[PDB]
Amino acid sequence: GLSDGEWQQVLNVWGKVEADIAGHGQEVLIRLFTGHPETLEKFDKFKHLKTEAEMKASEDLKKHGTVVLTALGGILKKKGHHEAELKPLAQSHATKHKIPIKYLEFISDAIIHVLHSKHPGDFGADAQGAMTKALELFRNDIAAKYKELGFQ
Numbered sequence: 631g632l633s634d635g636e637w638q639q640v641l642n643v644w645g646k647v648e649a650d651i652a653g654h655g656q657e658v659l660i661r662l663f664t665g666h667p668e669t670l671e672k673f674d675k676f677k678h679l680k681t682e683a684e685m686k687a688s689e690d691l692k693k694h695g696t697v698v699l700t701a702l703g704g705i706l707k708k709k710g711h712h713e714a715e716l717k718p719l720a721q722s723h724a725t726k727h728k729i730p731i732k733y734l735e736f737i738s739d740a741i742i743h744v745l746h747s748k749h750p751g752d753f754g755a756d757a758q759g760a761m762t763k764a765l766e767l768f769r770n771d772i773a774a775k776y777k778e779l780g781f782q
């Protein structure tokens with residue numbers, strides 16, 4: 631788990647995301663899709679996006695970015711007490727969307743990259759430690775649900 635201090639850092643960092651949820655969301659998905667094109671194939675509604683320019687110009691991608699980070703933000707604000715929030719996401723992502731846990735690793739890494747990219751010099755070593763711990767906890771709890779379902 632995370633310490634109280636670590637949770638406070640996580641939620642302080644998240645303040646940055648909340649000032650521009652769509653912009654952060656868009657950049658996270660673009661980072662995911664460009665670094666790992668196989669992930670784009672999981673989205674029927676985005677696999678028409680051939681180029682990063684098309685991704686950047688896609689208002690629906692920005693919209694989905696907002697949905698994703700809003701969901702994650704709600705989870706983070708539970709400070710690990712997130713069973714009710716996490717269970718349905720784990721189940722939809724395993725059973726409906728067929729998203730291997732590796733792709734959740736990819737998007738976790740994308741979040742860290744985007745935070746540094748948008749806030750260079752303002753995402754300190756302690757902050758990166760705390761956010762990484764929160765993202766791992768999220769991933770690990772999803773993985774438990776994936777194992778239950780025998781997914782991958």
Ligand code: HEM
Pocket residue numbers: 669670672673674675697698699701702718719722723727729733734737
């Ligand atoms: C931070 C981690 C993630 C969060 C919080 C998240 C959140 C969400 C939410 C709230 C939805 C809509 C409700 C639902 O279907 O459950 C959704 C849909 C979806 N997610 Fe995720 N997601 C994450 C990671 C991923 C990753 C890495 C992929 C890889 C491709 C993915 C693929 C999809 C797909 C294909 C849909 C359905 C889109 C549609 O039908 O239009 N998700 N996600």
Ligand SMILES: O=N[O-]
Pocket residue numbers: 659694698
């Ligand atoms: O973008 N993940 O839903």
